Amino acid sequence: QLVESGGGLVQTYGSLRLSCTASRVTLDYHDIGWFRQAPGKEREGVSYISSSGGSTNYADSVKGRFTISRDNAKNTVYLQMNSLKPEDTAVYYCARSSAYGSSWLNPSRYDYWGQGTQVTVSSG
Amino acid sequence: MKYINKLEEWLGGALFIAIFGILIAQILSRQVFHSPLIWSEELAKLLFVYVGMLGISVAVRKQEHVFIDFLTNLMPEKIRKFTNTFVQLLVFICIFLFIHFGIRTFNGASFPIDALGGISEKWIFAALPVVAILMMFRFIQAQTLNFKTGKSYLPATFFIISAVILFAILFFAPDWFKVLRISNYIKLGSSSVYVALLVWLIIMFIGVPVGWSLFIATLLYFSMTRWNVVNAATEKLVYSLDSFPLLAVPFYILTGILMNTGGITERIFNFAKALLGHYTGGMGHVNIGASLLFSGMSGSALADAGGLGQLEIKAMRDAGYDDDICGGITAASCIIGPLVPPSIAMIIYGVIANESIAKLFIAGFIPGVLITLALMAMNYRIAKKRGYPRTPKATREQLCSSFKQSFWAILTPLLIIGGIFSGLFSPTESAIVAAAYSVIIGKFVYKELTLKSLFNSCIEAMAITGVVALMIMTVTFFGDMIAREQVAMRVADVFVAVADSPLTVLIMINALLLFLGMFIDALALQFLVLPMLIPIAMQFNIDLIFFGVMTTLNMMVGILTPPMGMALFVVARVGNMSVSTVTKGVLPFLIPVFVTLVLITIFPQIITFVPNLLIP
């Protein structure tokens, strides 16, 4: 039921953007989140962005060059990704993780998701 | 000796005062020490799980669960005995799929609270099976009293050997459990939804208590699958109890109890007796205007009726006025209760919508104006031809004397709405500071607060939030099938074939909600109708801000509507007189309620204006 925009491939540093587009639904309950998944999996992620404060959380396996932006009033959130290394490659999601205090990633994806999107970069 | 009978509940009380402690320190300390004691704010969330589910064990032990009863009034002595047995047996099936799903949660998880560098997260999930083992013994004990009282066919020993065998078949040969799927016999695909909803509504109207009936509906979808549902909902289930605004619900209920049991209502009444009563129609003016304060004291509609009733009846009686007019005005007094913080049903809608209580309460106060004002106008409209006598004069000496002596209590609503309205405090701490405030003034400015009274009040509050805890949790399992199988698009196809305007759906949905409001009580119906209709409303692009205040306002018409409307019976209970007196007493008061409902129904700009000006 959610809607997304962004993704692509990079010409022979660069950084794609992906975005969650509040299509139709409420999208400012004071959490939102983002994930990517492998062949044979659905338990992998970035961790929280906050509506207030400009607070940003990440897992340490993620620490580094992935980046965060939001506007409440045109309800629009975007992630931007600088690594461009093959381990980045997966199938991708934005998810309305809402009202669950404890976890960076667990199924706390209570109310919704985009059907996932594909992004890809590999050598020459 | 006597404590031995309820030790796990008194453990619940000892947890609960730990909550009250943690957060009174937290909110004042946050400001005054100018950096956050962050551990506290997260520790609170864990502690709430346990007291929440201890509350389920109370509602289990007492058999105080919410249900629909109508068929029991229709049904013969035997057919009852069977259906009672068949239902309660189906609940004995529930708790095993619960414990099985409990263990199949637990070894699947290995995630700590990294917001505090990870201490013992597994402790949340472990709570479910350990307290559910207590629920198992409590539940079998309760049904033994049902059979001793001839309600049912079967002895304890039946269920016990059943428990034994169900564990034993998992312990040694669960392939024979894999035989118990319907999957060898079926072809549903998408039509599984319409089946699951049919059998759901049937077992609900059969009088299966609401939470367990939803658990049966949600497991009955498992029979249709070939797939994942075993993991997916299970982890969601207890971990959804973690959520923060729900912690406000216990403290608001506690605040209602302490404030009412202190006799403070008579002081707010005698303040109004001067301030408004010197205008003719005074009996009505005091009830109607003071109800904004009384609702701020009481936190739920029944607590306004049960608290105020003797005073307002005595005032009308001493005036020599008509008992049906008393019944009418006092029913409308209880309708004011839901408009105003504190309000349980509002907050439950906040949870099930996953929307913030701040942006809802600062909206809810606008219908706070409109209902109270139109009700005040109807009091005048009737009176100026009914021919009641004119009220006494007043002067400042008695009026300000009454004000000083009341004044310490008068802050109570002005604390809870005011802290949110000014934006200095968020919902949870507003409830907790109100609890603190009501106790501390009540200890020293007044004297009836016994050392025991805090725990006595806490056990009621925690017990009632038990009912809530089951109902939230079970509803949020329903939030697997709905989002899984997209009921939204199939119900939309029926409407979407013609559907044009928000007004169309709003009035049609309000009509359904009203119609069920004739026949299923509000404290059940809320949980029945929100879970899927909130999505449908979102599919028609409705603002869930509006839809919360609109549908909770329908519940108020529901509690005001016979045959089901329990508040009508509460008014009869305090009124000592017939429901035929009540019905004509209420009869005109509904008209301004429906007008004010229609006014917001046709013109969203009213509810929009204050929240969107202050908040945007």
Tokens of A69: 């932006």
Token pair 């040694």: residue: B172
Which chain B positions have a beta carbon within 8 Å of A30's beta carbon? 356
Nearest to B561, CA basis, from B580, B583, B578: B583
Residue A53: inside a domain: yes
Q: In Å, how far is A121's CA from the nearest CA of chain B? A: 31
Say which residues have a Cβ less than 8 Å from residue A78's Cβ, sequence separation at least 6: A6, A17, A18, A19, A20, A69, A70
Dihedral in degrees, nearest 10, Cα atoms B83, B86, B92, B97: -120
A40: domain CATH number is: 2.60.40.10
Which one of A30, A60, A110 makes the best mutation probe of the B interface by having the most chain B beta carbons within 10 Å? A110
Question: B254 phi and psi, to 5 degrees?
Answer: -55, -45
Q: How far apart are CA B80 and CA B71, in angstroms?
A: 9
Tokens of B134: 């207590």
Tokens of B141: 């004990």
Residue A106: inside a domain: yes
Nearest to A58, CA basis, from B115, B43, B239: B115
DSSP string, B526-553: HHHHHHHHHHHHHHTT--HHHHHHHHHH
In B, minimum Cα distance to A112 occurs at B483
DSSP string, A23-56: -SS---SS-BEEEEE-TT----B---B-SSTT-B
**Whether A102 contacts B124, CB under 8 Å:** yes
Q: In Å, how far is A14's CA from the nearest CA of chain B? A: 32
Is the omega angle on the peptide bond into residue B342 within 30 degrees of 0, that is, cis? yes
Domain that holds residue A90: 1-119
Q: Is B111 on the interface with A (CB under 8 A)?
A: yes
What is the distance, to the nearest Å, from the Cα of residue B80 to the centroid of all Cα atoms in its chain? 29
Q: How far apart are CA B339 and CA B346, in angstroms?
A: 8
Q: How far apart are CA B248 and CA B347, in angstroms?
A: 9
Token pair 């529930």: residue: B94
Question: B520 phi and psi, to 5 degrees?
Answer: -130, 130
Nearest to B358, CA basis, from A28, A55, A21, A95: A28
Tokens of B100: 């099985």
Q: How far apart are CA B157 and CA B143, in angstroms?
A: 11
Q: How far apart are CA B263 and CA B58, in angstroms?
A: 28
Beta bridge partners of A6: A18
Beta bridge partners of A78: A19, A69
Residue A124: inside a domain: no
Tokens of A39: 């062949």
Tokens of B187: 């072809």
Beta bridge partners of A5: A19
**Whether B15 contacts B50, CB under 8 Å:** yes
Helix, strand, or coil (residue A22): coil
Dihedral in degrees, nearest 10, Cα atoms B393, B397, B398, B401: 150
Dihedral in degrees, nearest 10, Cα atoms B72, B76, B81, B82: -90
* Residue B344: Cβ within 10 Å count: 23
Which chain A positions have a beta carbon within 8 Å of B357's beta carbon? none
Token pair 């805090």: residue: B454
DSSP string, B432-497: HHHHHHHHHHHHHT-----TTHHHHHHHHHHHHHHHHHHHHHHHHHHHHHHHHHTHHHHHHHHHHT
* Residue B563: Cβ within 10 Å count: 10
Q: How far apart are CA B214 and CA B478, in angstroms?
A: 7
**CB within 8 Å: B243 and A73:** no
Residue type, B499: A
**CB within 8 Å: A98 and B354:** yes
Q: In Å, how far is B459's CA from the nearest CA of chain A? A: 26
Nearest to B459, CA basis, from B26, B57, B27, B46: B57
**Whether B271 contacts B410, CB under 8 Å:** yes
Domain tally, chain A:
1
Q: How far apart are CA B589 and CA B305, in angstroms?
A: 16
Say which residues have a Cβ less than 8 Å from residue B597's Cβ, sequence separation at least 6: B510, B550, B553, B554, B557
In A, minimum Cα distance to B543 occurs at A26
- Whole-Å CA distances, B355 to B10, B348, B487: 33, 10, 21
Type and span of the H or E element at B81: helix B77-106
Say which residues have a Cβ less than 8 Å from residue B214's Cβ, sequence separation at least 6: B200, B474, B475, B477, B478, B527
Q: How far apart are CA B342 and CA B356, in angstroms?
A: 14
Q: How far apart are CA B146 and CA B159, in angstroms?
A: 14
**Whether B551 contacts B503, CB under 8 Å:** no
Phi-psi region of A78 (alpha: psi -120 to 50; beta: other; left: phi over 0): beta
Sign of torsion, CA B331 B334 B335 B336?
A: positive
Breaks (C-N over 2.5 A) in chain A follow: 12
Which one of A102, A111, A112 makes the best mutation probe of the B interface by having the most chain B beta carbons within 10 Å? A102
Token pair 């999996």: residue: A41
Sign of torsion, CA B292 B298 B299 B305?
A: negative
Beta bridge partners of A49: A32, A56
Residue A75: inside a domain: yes
Token pair 């402690």: residue: B21
Q: How far apart are CA B270 and CA B330, in angstroms?
A: 17
Nearest to B332, CA basis, from B124, B588, B14: B588
Q: In Å, how far is A3's CA from the nearest CA of chain B? A: 14
Which chain B positions have a beta carbon within 8 Å of A3's beta carbon? none
Question: A91 phi and psi, to 5 degrees?
Answer: -110, 145
Nearest to B117, CA basis, from B19, B39, B44: B39
Q: How far apart are CA B114 and CA A102, in angstroms?
A: 8
Tokens of A20: 């969650």
Tokens of B465: 């939030």
Q: How far apart are CA B112 and CA B447, in angstroms?
A: 46
Q: How far apart are CA B19 and CA B17, in angstroms?
A: 5
When CB atoms are compared, the residue of B242, B356, B539 closest to A100 is B242
Q: How far apart are CA B120 and CA B57, in angstroms?
A: 24
**Whether B334 contacts B302, CB under 8 Å:** yes
Is the omega angle on the peptide bond into residue A39 within 30 degrees of 0, that is, cis? no
Q: How far apart are CA B23 and CA B39, in angstroms?
A: 11
* Residue B461: Cβ within 10 Å count: 25
What end-to-end distance do the CA atoms of chain A give, in Å? 36
Which chain A positions have a beta carbon within 8 Å of B541's beta carbon? 24
- Whole-Å CA distances, B364 to B11, B341, B428: 36, 9, 17
Nearest to B265, CA basis, from B232, B228, B308, B301: B308
Question: A63 phi and psi, to 5 degrees?
Answer: -60, 140
**Whether A124 contacts A12, CB under 8 Å:** yes
Token pair 């229609």: residue: B598
**Whether B19 contacts B40, CB under 8 Å:** no
Question: B161 phi and psi, to 5 degrees?
Answer: -60, -30
Helix, strand, or coil (residue B521): coil
Burial of residue A57 (number of CB atoms within 10 Å: 0-12, 13-18, 19+): middle
**CB within 8 Å: A102 and B236:** no
The technique is: cryo-EM
Q: How far apart are CA B336 and CA B328, in angstroms?
A: 13
Residue A81: inside a domain: yes
**Whether B596 contacts B588, CB under 8 Å:** no
- Whole-Å CA distances, B55 to B41, B45, B61, B140: 22, 16, 10, 17
Burial of residue B58 (number of CB atoms within 10 Å: 0-12, 13-18, 19+): buried
Q: How far apart are CA B262 and CA B406, in angstroms?
A: 13
**Whether A32 contacts A15, CB under 8 Å:** no
Which chain B positions have a beta carbon within 8 Å of A114's beta carbon? none
3-state DSSP of A83-114:
CCCHHHCEEEEEECCCCCCCCCCCCCCCCCEC
Q: Is B483 on the interface with A (CB under 8 A)?
A: yes
